[PDB]
Design an enzyme around this catalytic site. Sequence first.
Site, PDB file in Angstrom:
ATOM      1  N   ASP A 512       0.760  -1.222   0.000  1.00 26.57           N
ATOM      2  CA  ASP A 512       0.000   0.000   0.000  1.00 26.57           C
ATOM      3  C   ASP A 512       0.804   1.292   0.000  1.00 26.57           C
ATOM      4  O   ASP A 512       1.890   1.391   0.569  1.00 26.57           O
ATOM      5  CB  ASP A 512      -0.969   0.049   1.205  1.00 26.57           C
ATOM      6  CG  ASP A 512      -0.274   0.055   2.531  1.00 26.57           C
ATOM      7  OD1 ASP A 512       0.587  -0.813   2.775  1.00 26.57           O
ATOM      8  OD2 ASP A 512      -0.673   0.884   3.394  1.00 26.57           O
ATOM      9  N   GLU A 513       0.256   2.268  -0.680  1.00 24.67           N
ATOM     10  CA  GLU A 513       0.683   3.646  -0.708  1.00 24.67           C
ATOM     11  C   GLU A 513       2.131   3.920  -1.082  1.00 24.67           C
ATOM     12  O   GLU A 513       2.781   4.797  -0.473  1.00 24.67           O
ATOM     13  CB  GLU A 513       0.399   4.145   0.723  1.00 24.67           C
ATOM     14  CG  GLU A 513      -1.052   4.128   1.053  1.00 24.67           C
ATOM     15  CD  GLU A 513      -1.444   4.675   2.380  1.00 24.67           C
ATOM     16  OE1 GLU A 513      -0.732   4.631   3.351  1.00 24.67           O
ATOM     17  OE2 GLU A 513      -2.562   5.223   2.448  1.00 24.67           O
TER      18      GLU A 513
HETATM   19  C1  LIG Z   1      -4.741  11.406   8.819  1.00 25.61           C
HETATM   20  C2  LIG Z   1      -5.434  10.440   7.901  1.00 25.61           C
HETATM   21  O1  LIG Z   1      -6.644  10.290   7.977  1.00 25.61           O
HETATM   22  N1  LIG Z   1      -4.689   9.821   6.947  1.00 25.61           N
HETATM   23  C3  LIG Z   1      -5.125   8.858   5.986  1.00 25.61           C
HETATM   24  C4  LIG Z   1      -4.163   7.621   5.961  1.00 25.61           C
HETATM   25  O2  LIG Z   1      -4.290   7.077   7.314  1.00 25.61           O
HETATM   26  C5  LIG Z   1      -4.740   6.589   4.976  1.00 25.61           C
HETATM   27  O3  LIG Z   1      -3.885   5.442   4.936  1.00 25.61           O
HETATM   28  C6  LIG Z   1      -4.378   4.060   4.952  1.00 25.61           C
HETATM   29  O4  LIG Z   1      -5.265   3.992   6.013  1.00 25.61           O
HETATM   30  C7  LIG Z   1      -4.963   3.525   7.277  1.00 25.61           C
HETATM   31  C8  LIG Z   1      -5.703   4.273   8.362  1.00 25.61           C
HETATM   32  O5  LIG Z   1      -7.122   4.083   8.153  1.00 25.61           O
HETATM   33  C9  LIG Z   1      -3.460   3.590   7.525  1.00 25.61           C
HETATM   34  O6  LIG Z   1      -3.224   3.164   8.834  1.00 25.61           O
HETATM   35  C10 LIG Z   1      -2.736   2.814   6.435  1.00 25.61           C
HETATM   36  O7  LIG Z   1      -1.384   2.838   6.745  1.00 25.61           O
HETATM   37  C11 LIG Z   1      -3.193   3.144   5.082  1.00 25.61           C
HETATM   38  N2  LIG Z   1      -3.222   1.997   4.184  1.00 25.61           N
HETATM   39  C12 LIG Z   1      -4.222   1.132   4.148  1.00 25.61           C
HETATM   40  C13 LIG Z   1      -4.088  -0.006   3.220  1.00 25.61           C
HETATM   41  O8  LIG Z   1      -5.325   1.451   4.649  1.00 25.61           O
HETATM   42  C14 LIG Z   1      -4.981   7.235   3.655  1.00 25.61           C
HETATM   43  C15 LIG Z   1      -5.690   6.423   2.561  1.00 25.61           C
HETATM   44  O9  LIG Z   1      -5.563   7.112   1.298  1.00 25.61           O
HETATM   45  O10 LIG Z   1      -5.555   8.516   3.625  1.00 25.61           O
HETATM   46  C16 LIG Z   1      -5.220   9.441   4.592  1.00 25.61           C
HETATM   47  O11 LIG Z   1      -5.760  10.631   4.493  1.00 25.61           O
END
Ligand SMILES: CC(=O)N[C@@H]1[C@@H](O)[C@H](O[C@@H]2O[C@H](CO)[C@@H](O)[C@H](O)[C@H]2NC(C)=O)[C@@H](CO)O[C@H]1O
Length: 858
Positions: A512-513
């Site tokens: 991911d990401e």
């Molecule tokens: C501050 C915030 O809301 N950030 C978001 C990231 O957390 C998010 O990443 C994904 O979501 C999880 C948390 O719900 C993370 O812990 C994780 O590492 C990550 N990856 C996965 C597969 O979920 C992203 C998603 O685009 O957006 C942010 O804004």
Amino acid sequence: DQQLVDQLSQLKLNVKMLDNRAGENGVDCAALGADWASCNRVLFTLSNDGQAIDGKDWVIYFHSPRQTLRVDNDQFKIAHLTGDLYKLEPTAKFSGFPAGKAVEIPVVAEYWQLFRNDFLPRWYATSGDAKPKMLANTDTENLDQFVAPFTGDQWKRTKDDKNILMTPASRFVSNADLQTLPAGALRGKIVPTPMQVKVHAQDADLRKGVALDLSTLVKPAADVVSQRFALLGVPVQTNGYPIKTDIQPGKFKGAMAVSGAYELKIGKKEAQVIGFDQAGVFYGLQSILSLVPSDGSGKIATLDASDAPRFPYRGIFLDVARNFHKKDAVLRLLDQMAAYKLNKFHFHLSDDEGWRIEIPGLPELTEVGGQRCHDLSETTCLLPQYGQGPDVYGGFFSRQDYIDIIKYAQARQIEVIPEIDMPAHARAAVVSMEARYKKLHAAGKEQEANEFRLVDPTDTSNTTSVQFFNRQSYLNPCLDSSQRFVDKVIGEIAQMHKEAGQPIKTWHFGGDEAKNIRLGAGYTDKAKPEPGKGIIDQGNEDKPWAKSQVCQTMIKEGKVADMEHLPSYFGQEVSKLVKAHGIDRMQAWQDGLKDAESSKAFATSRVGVNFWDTLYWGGFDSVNDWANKGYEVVVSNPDYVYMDFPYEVNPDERGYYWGTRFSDERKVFSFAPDNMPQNAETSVDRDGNHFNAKSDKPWPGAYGLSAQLWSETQRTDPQMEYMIFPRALSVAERSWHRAGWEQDYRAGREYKGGETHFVDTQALEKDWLRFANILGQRELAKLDKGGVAYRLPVPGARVAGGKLEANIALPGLGIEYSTDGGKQWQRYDAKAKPAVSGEVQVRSVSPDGKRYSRAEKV
Ligand SMILES: CC(=O)N[C@@H]1[C@@H](O)[C@H](O[C@@H]2O[C@H](CO)[C@@H](O)[C@H](O)[C@H]2NC(C)=O)[C@@H](CO)O[C@H]1O
């Protein structure tokens, strides 16, 4: 010096939201480099009840999930270190923290901060020599000590936000279709719901105990069953009600001839479980256990049932990397999973902020990656993250701890799926391997130092991760040392699994990401700024590994096409390592495998993807493409089954909320994972708006369902448990049982929220009313007995015709009210409502009477 730190430690912090929509109110967020020109204004106030603090040789460290973009008190400045760690420093204009006065520091942050949980505890001060000390009022898990209450419309993301704020009066309306069912209507009701059941009028008597024939089960499994009967109050003794078991694979045909299938017959004189296999027997035994009432009565309905899981993969994902969760909490989680027939435990053991599994031969992974502390050199710790203070914070599972957990899961018919996230989300590993590199390099052991190094020393790529780390978050996929590291870790974890007696069946690659967020769509370049976007200098922004010499020669020898295909290429290479270790299935977050041609590009004969695109944004259509390319789709949509998201739209609730604003027990239950378009009629998007959904593509169906607990703000084990339970019971239901209101997928059917009426929402409603009642009247009392600190819903309440009327999301739970400010609490009786005047507060109480929900005013 120390004196200065001691003075700063006694400053009292107060955090107050000023404006969550600053961009709508005259702040140019775009000029500040805010993604999508969205920013918020917050006030930090530091109060001094001591003497004047006039030193300038200090830094105050704080955490935030939001980047600070502007500071509006020119005596101070804020700079980012890495990840969520920021520093507050005095400028040349600082003239001190005056004696007995408050200093106000207004700031502008990116995005919005809609929940008070967005503000992190344990700010700390440093100065030269000195040992770091926290600002004492912030050293807490209770935000009320330092974060002011949200008021007015501060919970709104935009001026058009259509979510509904939940207070006792609006919650009363959302719960008004619920009623408490008579106990007779819950007789013979197993959940998950069995595929087929016929309930008879006689009841079996379990009061003198049960006599169990667990001969079909290996000892550890038979012991789980025996302990669980005893937990729920049915003693095990030879003279008791006979429960007989057998395994008979030949009695099951077609799609019922799968692991976990069983036939169950409960009679007045005895019971019989016939499983397809041991899981099937174990599961038929958990179905009897589900009928045992929470009233001491020892009676269960006689019935005939035949059952089998709708999906072979019914998972719970746990992040132990963001914040560690102890062995005891993992075990409790596995107990509850087994009770509701969940069989896959996806274990996220590493990420940027921690590495939680002891690996023989690579001690730095746990010695360094396993702990966070204020160590700017990151030689003994990773930098502090997530508001756990400046001192050592961490933990990890030793090799034996891990083997224990696997044995525990195996007895409970649960498969443990280890995830070591790569090639992004790998800072613990990268920084630990750098500390290893340095240590060995110092002893002059250069080949040893470089053996498992995860950095290309030539790499100067400028890349920002989703959580605001730089290039150290990205393990280099082009290095031969990286493959060595991967091979060694797979090898060592595979050996622990062999010893535990549950050989790995699925390796989770992560994936991911693996991108630079500064190149995303909401940012724009300083030179030809598109309106409504964060204005940044994008000309010096690189794709990950762009400046790695090793990755460049890999691209020129023709091995990979471009830097963009690196994540997928690496997934293909790791599948070869996984296969070489005797593992024939790999799983990944779908975005890491997007450039792979199909499942055929992988060395394992099975490739699963965790499908984590949101539905209202197009997921209802892009999911098809994965299943049709050969991947086993594990439905993991954030808008329904991310358990790190809030239960309700209330600023005092816990959670992240990027994919949706809330997901309660009811919404999770209403999710239809095998016909994605239909959720457009039964749910709303992240801003509370109706959406439409349609797919014209073929849908072969999903392989499984998984609910995720990410751990950013789940700092303690009770917090983890609050977020998973009781909504994971809704997950167990939907991953086992396909309801009648879950329609078959139809290519070309377009579901339109608020407009079409394809779904039988009255059947959905009746199904939920029964399920909510089983939770409130029977199952929550069992969670109490398993020691799980599940979330108690706050009541709904209104004052009508001079009396308090209250209700609850899970009918059967106790309700209390207070008419004196929450000093004396009294039990609410629906059939003798209390006459009320003035301020009323309500709270719910657990079945055992020991725990209460938060109290709210009507
Ligand atoms: C501050 C915030 O809301 N950030 C978001 C990231 O957390 C998010 O990443 C994904 O979501 C999880 C948390 O719900 C993370 O812990 C994780 O590492 C990550 N990856 C996965 C597969 O979920 C992203 C998603 O685009 O957006 C942010 O804004």
